[PDB]
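Deviation from plan, reported transparently: fe (iii) ion complex.
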Amino acid sequence: MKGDQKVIEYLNRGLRSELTAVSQYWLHYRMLEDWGYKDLAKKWRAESIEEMAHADKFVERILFLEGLPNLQTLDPLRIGQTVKEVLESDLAAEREARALYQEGAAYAASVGDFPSKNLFEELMGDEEHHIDFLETQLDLVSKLGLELYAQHHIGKLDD
Amino acid sequence: MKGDQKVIEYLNRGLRSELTAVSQYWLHYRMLEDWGYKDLAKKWRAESIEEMAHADKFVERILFLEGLPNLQTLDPLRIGQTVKEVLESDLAAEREARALYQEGAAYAASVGDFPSKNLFEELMGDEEHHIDFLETQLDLVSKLGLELYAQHHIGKLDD
Amino acid sequence: MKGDQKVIEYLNRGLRSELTAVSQYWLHYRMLEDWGYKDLAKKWRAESIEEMAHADKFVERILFLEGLPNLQTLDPLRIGQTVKEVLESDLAAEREARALYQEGAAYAASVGDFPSKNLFEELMGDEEHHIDFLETQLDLVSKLGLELYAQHHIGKLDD
Amino acid sequence: MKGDQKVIEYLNRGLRSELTAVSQYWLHYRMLEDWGYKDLAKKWRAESIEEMAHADKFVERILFLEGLPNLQTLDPLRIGQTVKEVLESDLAAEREARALYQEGAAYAASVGDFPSKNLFEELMGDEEHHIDFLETQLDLVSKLGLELYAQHHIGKLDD
Amino acid sequence: MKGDQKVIEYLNRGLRSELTAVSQYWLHYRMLEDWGYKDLAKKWRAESIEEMAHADKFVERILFLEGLPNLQTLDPLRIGQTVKEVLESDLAAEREARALYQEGAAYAASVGDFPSKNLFEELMGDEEHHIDFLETQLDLVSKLGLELYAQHHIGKLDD
Amino acid sequence: MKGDQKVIEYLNRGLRSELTAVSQYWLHYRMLEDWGYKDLAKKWRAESIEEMAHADKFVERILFLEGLPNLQTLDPLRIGQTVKEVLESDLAAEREARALYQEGAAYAASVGDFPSKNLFEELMGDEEHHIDFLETQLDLVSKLGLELYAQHHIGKLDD
Amino acid sequence: MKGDQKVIEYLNRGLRSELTAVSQYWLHYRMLEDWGYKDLAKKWRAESIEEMAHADKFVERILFLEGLPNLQTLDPLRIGQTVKEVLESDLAAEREARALYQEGAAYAASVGDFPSKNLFEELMGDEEHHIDFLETQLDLVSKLGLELYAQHHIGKLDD
Amino acid sequence: MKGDQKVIEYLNRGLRSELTAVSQYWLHYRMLEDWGYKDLAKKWRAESIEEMAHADKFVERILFLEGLPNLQTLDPLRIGQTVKEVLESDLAAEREARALYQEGAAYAASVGDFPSKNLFEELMGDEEHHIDFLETQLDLVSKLGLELYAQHHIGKLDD
Amino acid sequence: MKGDQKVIEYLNRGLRSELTAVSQYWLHYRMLEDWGYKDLAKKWRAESIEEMAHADKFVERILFLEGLPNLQTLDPLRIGQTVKEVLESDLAAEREARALYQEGAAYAASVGDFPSKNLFEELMGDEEHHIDFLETQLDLVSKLGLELYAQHHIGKLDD
Amino acid sequence: MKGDQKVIEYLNRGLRSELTAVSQYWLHYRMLEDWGYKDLAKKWRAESIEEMAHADKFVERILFLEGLPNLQTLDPLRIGQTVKEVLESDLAAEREARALYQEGAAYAASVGDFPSKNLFEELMGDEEHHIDFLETQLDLVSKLGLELYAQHHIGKLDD
Amino acid sequence: MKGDQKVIEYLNRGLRSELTAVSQYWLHYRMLEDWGYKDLAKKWRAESIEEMAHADKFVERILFLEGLPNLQTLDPLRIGQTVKEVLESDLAAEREARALYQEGAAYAASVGDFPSKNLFEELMGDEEHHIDFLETQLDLVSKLGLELYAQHHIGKLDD
Ligand code: HEM
Ligand code: HEM
Ligand code: HEM
Ligand SMILES: [Fe+3]
Ligand SMILES: [Fe+3]
Ligand SMILES: [Fe+3]
Ligand SMILES: [Fe+3]
Ligand SMILES: [Fe+3]
Ligand SMILES: [Fe+3]
Ligand SMILES: [Fe+3]
Ligand SMILES: [Fe+3]
Ligand SMILES: [Fe+3]
Ligand SMILES: [Fe+3]
Ligand SMILES: [Fe+3]
Ligand SMILES: [Fe+3]
Ligand SMILES: [Fe+3]
Ligand SMILES: [Fe+3]
Ligand SMILES: [Fe+3]
Ligand SMILES: [Fe+3]
Ligand SMILES: [Fe+3]
Ligand SMILES: [Fe+3]
Ligand SMILES: [Fe+3]
Ligand SMILES: [Fe+3]
Ligand SMILES: [Fe+3]
Ligand SMILES: [Fe+3]
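Because the crystal trials were delayed, the predicted structure below was used instead.
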């Protein structure tokens, strides 16, 4: 069905945001695993897979609206080299995603593309849940210190 | 609860749209069965039953808002006499439904009737899924030709 | 995440509305049980627990937006002393809740806080379902009289 | 059955005390969840639900004794801004509940209302168990320091 | 163990009160069955069996305290000739049982026989639950009229 | 085994009584169903089948005693045209059956045919149970009025 | 159904007999338990519950015959203070019950009330089974002496 | 319990009748098996075991009534030497049993020993069922001839 | 929570009383096993374990009230050298425990420590059940002689 | 079987050692629970129950050897008031138990009482396992500090 | 492995002891069965089978140590002709076995054959368990008399 070109543009900007989140969370999952925080690594793997679903939803909507999904590039990655830097890096990216979806939802509503508006509003609520999670971890690092926070999430050793 | 009269009017126009879709999909299901495309007939039966649910949701909302649901008339039916004409007939009807729900949702939002707005936005997304399906079938008829497309969906013979 | 102060205010006004509904439905459940209408008492218990979930959703959102949830006060209770007065008391409260959520949803939409808007629109639809229920009971009391209506819902005696 | 008016006043004071504890524990559950202490949040949610049952027990006894349960107001809430302050706030409240139920039980015994006396004595023992739990948490904070105590109860990360 | 003689006299008075309630409720169960109110008959059969357990509890305590249980006589029965009269007859009896157990409990406490005090307080609470049930049935008769109340509890016809 | 001729006569008079009861209850079952009292209709069907068993027991005994069972005629039917007339019609027939079996049992005892006496005494007790049922329904119609009595037994609507 | 007045009198005399047996067996069950003969106590509990069923059958028949069941008084109790006196006390009561039922059955037969006759003949056979049991226990006490007889039935100690 | 001496005499005459039936049916079972009519032999074994139960019931009643059961002698056996003679022999014995029980039941009723009367009336009905069976077999031999009747009941050959 | 010092002294006296009962019953269990009365040994083992739970209840309450539980000493043990002496020794001890808990409960009530009062009243009732058991065993020894009583409880031989 | 008197003395000294260990571990279990170290409390409860088994084994052996078990007194308790003092207190007691059993085993071996020797050698090995446990906990407190050690064993909060 | 000759001698003396115990317990099992004490017979059968295992353990060890097991002769049997003589006979034999194993264990320890020492110490402990059993039975015969002791163990009659 031919879609509004500017909505398609916002969907492709959202696709690039999600592809950045997928790789930034996956690399941070494998860095947390390499550092030995196996329970933090488990959660970051699961968050990267949640963003993979979001990327797919954008690809599907762009094709339905007869646009061309662009998966060639990502937004710049932010790679942390301590557990606190990983939390901070992912929080900054997720704030930028939320603001993009707020703008995409308002734009789509202004042209009557309510199903696209509802996809951006659904993803904006999911990114505020990711933000809540990341802010909470940084709250614990502030109140307990980074070493008590991270030690709690080392996890179990493999068989 | 007494509703906005113009919202009730949009809900009754949507009810008439859905009653037309129910009968137009059911007659096309039974025409596809009569022609021998039993897998296409199965899908059209299921789409007619999805529109029956949509009609019921409009009847329920109109009564809650103390209006009088009107099931006496349908919009003009479009009856195809080849498989491609059936696809084209149902696509034209479903585009008209989507545009009605886009307008009903915007109107209800402008008067603060957010539950009615959300019913129209939910049905608008479901009709874009029906549109996607119908456009895809016409894409296959364009790329393969009608006879290869239809032959694939003849289905199994009855016991 | 720091939220819009006026949205936080609407969420706290909604929290007070729900805390009033929880206690007003719970007291009416126990009054209906004391009067012997055990099937009406069962339904009012379940409605009070639905409003407990709504109160919790407001507390969670206010904290996420870094506000301070205020559970200290309720709106004035309306306590019925006949079954019809209980129906009327709860209907008047639920109409006031619906109108508050309609205004909170419109305000949050105007500042781009779409997840808060969607929480108010979800609760507004749930309160219209509660309104529908309460209006229907008062319709039956109007058409049958209070004693036939209430006698039907006396229920079973305890073992 | 018409009850002693002063016993009904103690039962209503108890109802206010429990309504305060329900909301103080629930807000503290959601604050501990917001801060990331998910095992402390689980336990405060369960203690709030224990106080909801106590509130219900008072509403039921007041109606049986033909009084009017008053759910309009709470005692002043004490909201803590650190985990230690939440423990201290709830301990102060629960000490005041215990002393009220000690007095309610003695009064009801002095007028022969032994079923009400036994409700106040049952709830006094329950509040001493709550007091023992909160004193134990403060004892751990005193011996280990707040950060070690609170880190132990961060809990597991959500799927 | 040799008991206080006056506590054994209160226990025997209680035994007579329960034997009266067993027979008054059983005759009323069979009268309600004879009249055709099979759901009211089921409930009075179960209340009679509850009073049989109370009678047994008194026989057991009297023998442990080395007294002689007296089952020879009952208090005067009150037999109702309409459903409302059966409710009133059993309410009057149960008010007299409650007042006896209030006095038995106070006496036994004053001589330190706390296990007997606790048997009388347990049975006083049970009789207040019976009193609450019978007051509730009379409340329904007052609000709906006897015929609507009794018709609801006719029950099902036997296979 | 050749039986007493006069006992055989009483057994054949009892067979005619039962054949009348079978058809009078079956026709009243189908009249109650036609009028919409489906729970009364269920009970009357079951009572007609109980009388079918009684008819068969008479046929079996008459043949054992080498008599000729006569199923050609019935006693005059009493057909009610309101629910109260159906109750009254069946009560009058069942009183006549009971009196016949009382006389048959006394006659058979006077000639030493104790197995026939015991068949009449067993059926006389079963007809007093049917009488008890019918008297109870007429008691409820007297105390509640016919419309409250019958409305309670309308039953459930068919799928 | 209006019954023979003198049959009703015999049924009420039988009801008083059974109410005496219920309480005399229950008190002897609890005396045997208090003395430590737990297997004798089990059997006496079960015999008291058999007499409770017999009392109920008299109440049901008296109401069917439109009489007034009288549960106000018992025949004089016979309370044993050794195991042999308990056996002797219950045997004397049960002989008096059997003779009453023999007379009630003969009277009811003389007026044609065969269902009442059969209730008295059924209870007379059950009381001869109780007599057989009690005579057998006294036979064992005669042949073995009371202490060997009673020691065998001390039973098992409670967990 | 000391019984009526003449009732005891009738019970002992009935015991002798049953002991004769047990042995006469058992010998005929084994003669029918020896002749090869295995289905007739099965039925005669089962009838002999039914008479064993009847003999035991007489022994039990005689002892309860403090008489001395006499199992020393039987009534003269009638031994058939063809299948028809076996049927005829057992029919003549069973007619004599039925007449004895008719007289025993009338005698016991005349002295008020209703439980003994009911044992004789129960056995008289069971012997009329045995008579019915035996008369039916002789009816088939009369209508089909002995060889067709007996051939049908040869049965299956043993593994 | 800081407790009343004199209530803590009664709780410690109770703890000493229970520690004495645990060891007196356990030594008596092993003496009855040594003598071969295996069913009496099973029951004394279980009563000792009941007193272990009572001891624990006192240690828990004393620590909650911030006292120091004293397990260093026992009251003087009474060791029996025959089965009758073991019964008498344990009865004397349990009478002293019961009187202590009667006094502890009255004292705690007089200072408003109702949870401690209720622990002493619960244990007073439990010790009256122990007293009833031991009095019953002595009653059997008095009526049957010690050898018949003890032989019944020798029990089964081990595999 | 009459045992060596000095072996019996060593068994009674061992019984006193175990009774001291039972109460010292049980009081420390309840102190650790009161302080909030629920996983340490679980382990100390289990160790106290292991010592209860050891006490019982001494009672059984002393009775077999015809001695008199003495449970009247304990060795002086050592009560810790920090987690490290509890570990130290129990280690000092368990070293004294091990040395007693080493001496008892050598003595019993010198008089040929090999089953008693093997009971002391079995308990000496079990007390070295308890020593190993306690030394390991004190090793962790030395290497990590008391607060890290104890925080790890706080455990889970109760439902 | 070639063993110490004197250890082999002690093992063969122990084998002869066990073969004597096997046959002496088996003959006493069958004498107790013949006299009718079926529960004593069951226990003696099981004890004979325990000694069969002990005999086998000696045969196995003697062969491992390259000796020649000698099963040709037994020690003199002691055959009781009353239940008390059977108990006394088996106790005297088992005391002699225990003393032999005490000496065998000390001898084997003196030559370093610790596995043989441990076999003798294991059997010495098992024979002290058999001694305990037998002494206990003789204790019961002393306190109750032989006839009360033996009557308790007559057991159940065979199907
Ligand atoms: C802050 C105000 C309250 C909040 C946020 C709240 C929240 C909740 C929630 C979320 C549940 C369901 C718990 C679950 O299923 O896991 C619940 C249960 C319950 N609440 Fe409340 N509640 C509140 C006030 C009350 C009041 C005022 C009463 C009665 C006076 C009450 C009585 C109950 C009872 C009895 C249940 C358990 C119901 C059952 O298990 O069937 N609640 N509440
Ligand atoms: C009117 C006099 C009484 C009547 C008609 C009566 C009737 C009954 C019936 C029919 C049951 C069996 C209920 C069932 O299984 O559904 C029963 C149970 C019982 N009755 Fe009575 N009863 C009477 C007096 C008593 C007395 C005087 C006592 C004791 C003082 C007693 C104690 C019990 C107990 C304890 C049971 C339940 C037994 C169990 O569940 O194991 N009853 N009674
Ligand atoms: C004579 C001193 C004692 C002896 C011989 C003893 C013996 C025993 C034995 C053998 C058991 C396990 C029972 C079974 O599993 O069948 C046990 C259980 C128990 N004991 Fe003791 N005990 C003694 C003192 C104590 C003391 C002083 C306390 C507490 C103050 C105590 C508290 C318990 C509890 C609570 C259990 C049951 C534990 C459970 O079921 O989880 N015991 N005792
Ligand atoms: Fe995303
Ligand atoms: Fe995200
Ligand atoms: Fe649709
Ligand atoms: Fe559609
Ligand atoms: Fe709500
Ligand atoms: Fe609501
Ligand atoms: Fe509370
Ligand atoms: Fe609390
Ligand atoms: Fe009661
Ligand atoms: Fe009651
Ligand atoms: Fe019939
Ligand atoms: Fe009938
Ligand atoms: Fe009876
Ligand atoms: Fe009886
Ligand atoms: Fe027979
Ligand atoms: Fe027969
Ligand atoms: Fe205790
Ligand atoms: Fe005790
Ligand atoms: Fe130990
Ligand atoms: Fe240890
Ligand atoms: Fe051996
Ligand atoms: Fe042995």
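The helical segments of chain K are 5-35, 38-64, 83-110, 114-144, 146-152. We consider this an acceptable substitute for the interim report.
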